[PDB]
Design an enzyme around this catalytic site. Structure first.
Site, PDB file in Angstrom:
ATOM      1  CB  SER A  92     -12.170  12.043   2.142  1.00 49.71           C
ATOM      2  OG  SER A  92     -10.525  12.636   2.602  1.00 49.71           O
ATOM      3  CD  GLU A 130      -8.806   6.506   8.346  1.00 52.10           C
ATOM      4  OE1 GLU A 130      -8.445   7.079   7.206  1.00 52.10           O
ATOM      5  OE2 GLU A 130      -7.779   5.909   9.187  1.00 52.10           O
ATOM      6  CB  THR A 166     -10.008   1.156   8.552  1.00 55.45           C
ATOM      7  OG1 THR A 166     -10.454   0.490   9.923  1.00 55.45           O
ATOM      8  CG2 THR A 166      -9.390   3.204   8.749  1.00 55.45           C
ATOM      9  CE1 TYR A 167      -9.130  -7.193   7.112  1.00 46.71           C
ATOM     10  CE2 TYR A 167      -5.976  -6.813   6.048  1.00 46.71           C
ATOM     11  CZ  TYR A 167      -7.492  -7.886   7.032  1.00 46.71           C
ATOM     12  OH  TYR A 167      -6.694  -9.135   7.192  1.00 46.71           O
ATOM     13  CB  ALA A 215      -2.308  -5.034   8.761  1.00 48.22           C
ATOM     14  CG  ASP A 272       1.399  -1.336  11.939  1.00 48.06           C
ATOM     15  OD1 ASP A 272       1.339  -0.909  13.434  1.00 48.06           O
ATOM     16  OD2 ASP A 272       2.033  -0.759  11.493  1.00 48.06           O
ATOM     17  CE1 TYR A 328       3.464   6.669   6.081  1.00 46.97           C
ATOM     18  CE2 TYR A 328       2.862   7.195   8.329  1.00 46.97           C
ATOM     19  CZ  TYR A 328       2.741   5.905   6.896  1.00 46.97           C
ATOM     20  OH  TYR A 328       1.829   4.200   6.666  1.00 46.97           O
ATOM     21  CB  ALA A 337      11.814   5.565   7.062  1.00 41.91           C
ATOM     22  CG  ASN A 383       8.331   3.739   1.230  1.00 42.83           C
ATOM     23  OD1 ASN A 383       8.796   2.753  -0.150  1.00 42.83           O
ATOM     24  ND2 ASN A 383       7.713   4.714   1.753  1.00 42.83           N
ATOM     25  NE  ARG A 402      11.564   2.430  -3.545  1.00 40.95           N
ATOM     26  CZ  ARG A 402      11.578   2.648  -2.009  1.00 40.95           C
ATOM     27  NH1 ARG A 402      10.602   2.708  -1.041  1.00 40.95           N
ATOM     28  NH2 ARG A 402      12.426   3.114  -1.663  1.00 40.95           N
ATOM     29  CD  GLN A 444      -0.876   8.259  11.399  1.00 45.21           C
ATOM     30  OE1 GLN A 444      -1.562   8.999  10.967  1.00 45.21           O
ATOM     31  NE2 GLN A 444      -0.390   7.245  11.495  1.00 45.21           N
ATOM     32  CG  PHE A 456      -4.363   6.528  18.219  1.00 49.08           C
ATOM     33  CD1 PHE A 456      -6.381   7.327  18.091  1.00 49.08           C
ATOM     34  CD2 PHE A 456      -4.796   5.366  18.929  1.00 49.08           C
ATOM     35  CE1 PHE A 456      -7.215   6.531  18.154  1.00 49.08           C
ATOM     36  CE2 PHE A 456      -5.977   4.908  18.753  1.00 49.08           C
ATOM     37  CZ  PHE A 456      -7.406   5.025  18.268  1.00 49.08           C
ATOM     38  CG  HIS A 477      -8.258  11.053   4.726  1.00 53.01           C
ATOM     39  ND1 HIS A 477      -8.926  10.758   4.012  1.00 53.01           N
ATOM     40  CD2 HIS A 477      -7.998  10.427   5.751  1.00 53.01           C
ATOM     41  CE1 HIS A 477      -9.773   9.326   4.709  1.00 53.01           C
ATOM     42  NE2 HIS A 477      -8.610   9.611   5.587  1.00 53.01           N
TER      43      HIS A 477
HETATM   44  C1  LIG Z   1      -4.264   7.231   5.322  1.00 48.33           C
HETATM   45  C2  LIG Z   1      -3.778   6.121   6.388  1.00 48.33           C
HETATM   46  C3  LIG Z   1      -4.954   5.324   6.496  1.00 48.33           C
HETATM   47  C4  LIG Z   1      -4.482   4.019   7.350  1.00 48.33           C
HETATM   48  N1  LIG Z   1      -5.269   2.922   7.008  1.00 48.33           N
HETATM   49  C5  LIG Z   1      -4.624   1.467   7.681  1.00 48.33           C
HETATM   50  C6  LIG Z   1      -5.643   0.435   7.759  1.00 48.33           C
HETATM   51  O1  LIG Z   1      -6.653   0.362   7.421  1.00 48.33           O
HETATM   52  N2  LIG Z   1      -5.131  -0.669   8.032  1.00 48.33           N
HETATM   53  C7  LIG Z   1      -3.696  -0.889   8.337  1.00 48.33           C
HETATM   54  O2  LIG Z   1      -3.768  -2.147   8.661  1.00 48.33           O
HETATM   55  N3  LIG Z   1      -2.926   0.207   8.654  1.00 48.33           N
HETATM   56  C8  LIG Z   1      -3.561   1.491   7.952  1.00 48.33           C
HETATM   57  N4  LIG Z   1      -2.823   2.449   8.423  1.00 48.33           N
HETATM   58  C9  LIG Z   1      -0.851   2.269   9.095  1.00 48.33           C
HETATM   59  C10 LIG Z   1       0.069   1.769   8.119  1.00 48.33           C
HETATM   60  O3  LIG Z   1      -0.480   0.912   7.442  1.00 48.33           O
HETATM   61  C11 LIG Z   1       1.348   1.390   8.971  1.00 48.33           C
HETATM   62  O4  LIG Z   1       1.639   3.017   9.234  1.00 48.33           O
HETATM   63  C12 LIG Z   1       2.572   0.673   7.822  1.00 48.33           C
HETATM   64  O5  LIG Z   1       3.031   0.409   9.418  1.00 48.33           O
HETATM   65  C13 LIG Z   1       3.247   1.078   6.632  1.00 48.33           C
HETATM   66  O6  LIG Z   1       2.023   1.469   5.574  1.00 48.33           O
HETATM   67  P1  LIG Z   1       2.726   1.815   4.467  1.00 48.33           P
HETATM   68  O7  LIG Z   1       1.045   1.248   3.845  1.00 48.33           O
HETATM   69  O8  LIG Z   1       2.844   3.467   4.798  1.00 48.33           O
HETATM   70  O9  LIG Z   1       3.452   1.158   3.765  1.00 48.33           O
HETATM   71  P2  LIG Z   1       5.365   1.362   2.944  1.00 48.33           P
HETATM   72  O10 LIG Z   1       4.795   2.703   2.375  1.00 48.33           O
HETATM   73  O11 LIG Z   1       5.258   0.270   2.267  1.00 48.33           O
HETATM   74  O12 LIG Z   1       6.050   1.014   4.830  1.00 48.33           O
HETATM   75  C14 LIG Z   1       6.397   2.450   4.902  1.00 48.33           C
HETATM   76  C15 LIG Z   1       8.106   1.726   5.160  1.00 48.33           C
HETATM   77  O13 LIG Z   1       8.737   0.748   5.299  1.00 48.33           O
HETATM   78  C16 LIG Z   1       9.904   1.590   4.418  1.00 48.33           C
HETATM   79  N5  LIG Z   1       9.947   0.923   3.034  1.00 48.33           N
HETATM   80  C17 LIG Z   1       9.654   1.007   2.394  1.00 48.33           C
HETATM   81  N6  LIG Z   1       9.878   0.253   1.372  1.00 48.33           N
HETATM   82  C18 LIG Z   1      10.942  -0.036   1.344  1.00 48.33           C
HETATM   83  C19 LIG Z   1      11.985  -0.501   0.913  1.00 48.33           C
HETATM   84  N7  LIG Z   1      12.045  -1.345  -0.179  1.00 48.33           N
HETATM   85  N8  LIG Z   1      13.239  -0.896   1.633  1.00 48.33           N
HETATM   86  C20 LIG Z   1      13.123  -0.777   3.388  1.00 48.33           C
HETATM   87  N9  LIG Z   1      12.334  -0.161   3.882  1.00 48.33           N
HETATM   88  C21 LIG Z   1      10.824   0.089   3.129  1.00 48.33           C
HETATM   89  C22 LIG Z   1       9.538   2.607   4.736  1.00 48.33           C
HETATM   90  O14 LIG Z   1      10.319   4.243   4.609  1.00 48.33           O
HETATM   91  C23 LIG Z   1       7.967   2.945   6.305  1.00 48.33           C
HETATM   92  O15 LIG Z   1       9.362   3.222   7.336  1.00 48.33           O
HETATM   93  C24 LIG Z   1      -2.626   3.407   7.496  1.00 48.33           C
HETATM   94  C25 LIG Z   1      -1.924   4.887   7.336  1.00 48.33           C
HETATM   95  C26 LIG Z   1      -2.708   6.372   6.955  1.00 48.33           C
HETATM   96  C27 LIG Z   1      -1.049   7.512   7.382  1.00 48.33           C
END
Ligand SMILES: Cc1cc2nc3c(=O)[nH]c(=O)nc-3n(C[C@H](O)[C@H](O)[C@H](O)COP(=O)(O)OP(=O)(O)OC[C@H]3O[C@@H](n4cnc5c(N)ncnc54)[C@H](O)[C@@H]3O)c2cc1C
Ligand SMILES: Cc1cc2nc3c(=O)[nH]c(=O)nc-3n(C[C@H](O)[C@H](O)[C@H](O)COP(=O)(O)OP(=O)(O)OC[C@H]3O[C@@H](n4cnc5c(N)ncnc54)[C@H](O)[C@@H]3O)c2cc1C
Ligand SMILES: Cc1cc2nc3c(=O)[nH]c(=O)nc-3n(C[C@H](O)[C@H](O)[C@H](O)COP(=O)(O)OP(=O)(O)OC[C@H]3O[C@@H](n4cnc5c(N)ncnc54)[C@H](O)[C@@H]3O)c2cc1C
Ligand SMILES: Cc1cc2nc3c(=O)[nH]c(=O)nc-3n(C[C@H](O)[C@H](O)[C@H](O)COP(=O)(O)OP(=O)(O)OC[C@H]3O[C@@H](n4cnc5c(N)ncnc54)[C@H](O)[C@@H]3O)c2cc1C
Lengths: 265, 261, 276, 276
Positions: free
Chosen positions: C13, C15, C46-47, C49, C107, C134, C141, C150, C153, C165, C205, C255
């Protein structure tokens, strides 16, 4: 079973003299197959011979003096060889010494004198003056064919260097044991000087492991003991049944390392 | 990158008093994430403050449920919190209420940072390994930040436990409690009380060293350095050291982990 | 030998990110046509945030579907939108044929975490969902177990796959994959591969994502700031070695973080047996 | 790790050939300046036996000495010259500062074999001499032992080093190095490395020299006839892997068959720690 030997050097002060005998008493309870005493032209054979006689007289252990042929005439060497043999010294570490005669010539001259048990030097990282790695190996081969019982290697900190060297020796048709010389490190500054002047490579992980410990002797001892124990552990797993320790006249580290190898009183 | 913590105990003699404070000075230069002081299930509170006011490090006192009523605990809890002491190691205590009750109580008084005990090799009183695990989960679910394991020597057992824990839904790190062994007899004893297993290879490693303190320390440092190295490669980035008020072994082990002044 | 025989059993895949200039736009479509010939299982866009440039993302997606007929997955974040917007956006995607979404939180500039987005999306329709993982623990975390919990979940809410990542230490990934099993996570953990030609950028990065850079790697790029060609050769070597090793350890899915460039990823896939 | 620490302990030499066009001439001097910054122990210039273009070879040599001050070694063949010419040519080199020669026989269009040339050269002066070795046996040899014995004969006449034919199977080289010790050959056996960007051409050289091409390699280049970039990345990967392995097995010297190109060799040296 595992065989071990300890190497000592002639002390030049009353203090080091005491240290030496303390270490000999301590290490002898481990029943080493043999112990040896180095030679230093500017630091004489009589000092070396003296210590050898002392070890034999007080411990009954087999003691091999290191004999060099550089700056010695064949006639002198024969006289020296005959005297040690007639006085019970049947094992000699035959060396050329640092620059007429190579070690192989000394081995031949010694075998003509008597059926001495003979140990020679080998270099996993190639002798610094060798024409090439290939030549250094052929020369060890020639030296061995002159009639040696075992080869003892220069110290090394990269265990892989030793293992690859052992395989090359086997491929070269060298049948005697290639006993690794182990240098337990407690004083890293001194070890670096030794390695530098012998072309031995000190890996980065190691230099980093001793970084910041210049004034911390206790931590250096613990760190160095750990490195040594790990190295002999790997060597044992790879089939090494013989180890030669460069004690630098100190017993604690080598004694402890032998313990982890199962070599105990 | 690696967080470390040092555990001490209240000195019982003048000699040990001097030794402790020297070790505290020595170990502090490593900037541990926190240091803690055990509580015999009186002088604990003083040491904590002494440590706090002397090094500025976060000192977490140990607190048990032995010979103390909920009212008294809340009192202590409050007295500690108002003294700049916001981290506490909650324990049931060496023999009413369990450690889980203590944490709920403590959290009820304030937002306390809490460390509790875990047992890779099963707590002696526990009915079974699964019961003790579920118990840990409940204790954690009560409001703990991290669990600290009883010392151990079989890395395998610790790792499987760490795996079981997350599998059981426990959301905190199971920080390995490291016991650097220079006195095998003493450690052999500790293991007898704590139900900790002394592997055969370890017993064989110390055999014949009863009167060789020097060799014991080298052998011990080797075992501990090898342990943390395997642990670090397994992802563990946290270590709690049972220093027994001595600094050299833990200091050296930290050095190999990259934790230096 | 192994990498040779594995030819034909690997899924890939790619990206991409919304171009910000005409130059990057042309580069992107060229990479898309080139990479399209490899028949990737899917490609994603990507998008950023908190960027408010979501229009650019959906645009590129449609363009990819129109021009190549390949399954295109948009990255949707929730930290910067409300549940209603999200559902609205979700509905629009479904009705336009976009049935695969990379559900992310994004983020912090909260009210929602990725797991909430996964639940929200599943209520709207039966989307194919990918989420972030990750190997070296998400920076926010509290603990590795929490992060791992998480992920579970998140996965339990209805996920088809996890995409890690990027990482440079292969053991970190292999260990994580094992810990995922220990945590009861039942989806494949697809490694995200970041081929490096620009080390200064990869370094930023990495330090920005808590990803470790071994010393040997830093050593490899030392002295190459003004030597792009040697950088690409060095980087391709590192990337090719990593996938060869991962492939021997069972990984059958990769990926690629292409950064809109095709050559490096194209060549790495080639060594994996993924050819036109 | 190992390849990283070995940094600074590796010697390198580069081989070039007389350009036949203005384009190749410019390419050659560019590669020379670029590769010169790596401070090679020496560089050498081929001479096609039975070509009668010996003027081109000596020319390039002088030009390299003038422009870089690096030791330049011409390749001298004997199959197409008489002992007198040879001695005459030898004298001229010595008096012009060319004290290192790659003594070769040359392909049959005899009266002389490389060993005769080595003896002839040593009678003229105390030249530094390099000779050819064949890990996979010279095609005309009656047996591997004969070929190996020939190498010893050649070496015994006064050789400083042997440089092997290129190879793609690393074990073939390692075994040969060991058999050389068994044969009493005391000079270092320097592996000649041929970085491949043009597979069709390497294939022709291989089948022309009896050099084996493993299947995995042929597989790697399959389908790349019209993809030069992927070829260079694939080839650099193969070359970098080979030297990494050889380096771990003790090799501290490498001779590169550059084909007048610098990028691939330059990058391979970089990974070996050989930098400006
Ligand atoms: C394949 C891939 C593609 C990505 N593409 C993009 C993109 O297009 N755009 C963009 O903006 N970012 C992108 N990211 C980056 C990402 O959005 C960030 O790393 C972000 O800070 C966390 O996103 P997540 O989806 O892992 O969220 P989660 O899984 O919700 O977030 C993880 C963080 O919150 C903590 N957490 C989760 N649930 C809880 C809870 N209920 N209470 C307290 N803490 C909790 C986790 O342990 C962790 O530290 C990408 C990452 C990967 C690996
Ligand atoms: C276990 C050990 C103990 C040592 N103890 C001491 C000591 O107590 N005192 C001391 O002064 N030094 C000692 N040394 C160091 C040693 O003397 C130096 O390394 C010395 O330069 C060479 O000695 P050698 O016996 O290896 O000589 P050789 O085996 O003769 O080798 C020296 C060199 O000459 C070449 N060579 C060997 N034979 C021939 C030949 N027949 N013809 C041509 N070339 C040949 C070799 O390849 C090599 O480069 C010891 C070394 C070891 C590894
Ligand atoms: C890091 C560390 C530091 C320590 N420091 C000290 C100290 O300073 N002072 C001191 O006295 N001791 C100390 N201990 C030892 C500890 O107090 C003992 O092991 C003691 O047996 C109580 O254990 P606990 O805190 O684990 O409490 P708990 O978790 O309450 O008790 C463990 C036992 O009770 C069972 N259990 C737990 N909750 C329940 C429940 N709700 N219902 C039924 N069964 C339950 C468990 O399965 C287990 O058998 C320490 C231990 C560790 C590992
Ligand atoms: C590093 C390197 C650089 C080269 N550069 C060039 C170049 O610039 N120009 C060019 O034209 N070619 C060059 N060649 C190719 C080479 O000249 C051919 O491979 C040639 O056919 C043999 O040359 P040689 O020097 O190995 O000769 P030798 O070592 O004389 O030749 C080898 C062949 O003759 C056999 N042989 C040797 N002695 C005898 C004997 N007394 N009786 C019978 N058989 C015998 C050998 O076993 C073998 O088959 C190079 C090769 C190498 C590996």
């Amino acid at each position: 079973q595992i065989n071990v030997s300890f190497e000592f050097f002639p002390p030049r002060t009353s203090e080091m003299e005491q240290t030496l005998w303390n270490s000999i008493d301590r290490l002898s309870s481990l029943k080493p197959k043999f112990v040896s005493v180095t030679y230093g032209a500017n630091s004489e054979r009589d000092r070396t011979h003296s210590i050898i006689k002392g070890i034999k007289d007080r411990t009954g252990l087999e003691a091999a003096p290191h004999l060099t042929c550089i700056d010695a005439t064949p006639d002198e060497l024969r006289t020296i060889a005959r005297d040690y043999w007639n006085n019970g010294i049947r094992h000699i570490v035959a060396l050329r010494g640092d620059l007429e005669m190579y070690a192989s010539d000394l081995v031949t001259l010694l075998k003509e004198v008597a059926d001495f048990d003979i140990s020679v030097a080998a270099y996993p990282e190639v002798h610094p003056e060798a024409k090439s790695a290939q030549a250094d190996l052929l020369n060890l081969k020639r030296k061995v064919d002159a009639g040696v019982n075992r080869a003892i290697t220069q110290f090394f900190f990269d265990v892989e260097s030793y293992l690859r060297f052992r395989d090359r020796c086997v491929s070269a048709g060298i049948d005697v044991e290639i006993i690794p010389g182990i240098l337990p490190v407690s004083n890293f500054k001194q070890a670096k000087k030794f390695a530098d002047m012998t072309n031995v490579r000190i890996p980065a992980w190691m230099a980093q492991m001793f970084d910041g410990l210049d004034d911390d002797a206790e931590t250096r001892k613990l760190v160095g003991a750990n490195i040594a124990m790990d190295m002999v552990k790997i060597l044992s797993r790879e089939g090494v049944k013989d180890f030669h320790f460069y004690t630098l006249n100190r017993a604690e580290m080598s004694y402890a390392i032998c313990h982890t190898l199962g070599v105990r009183p």
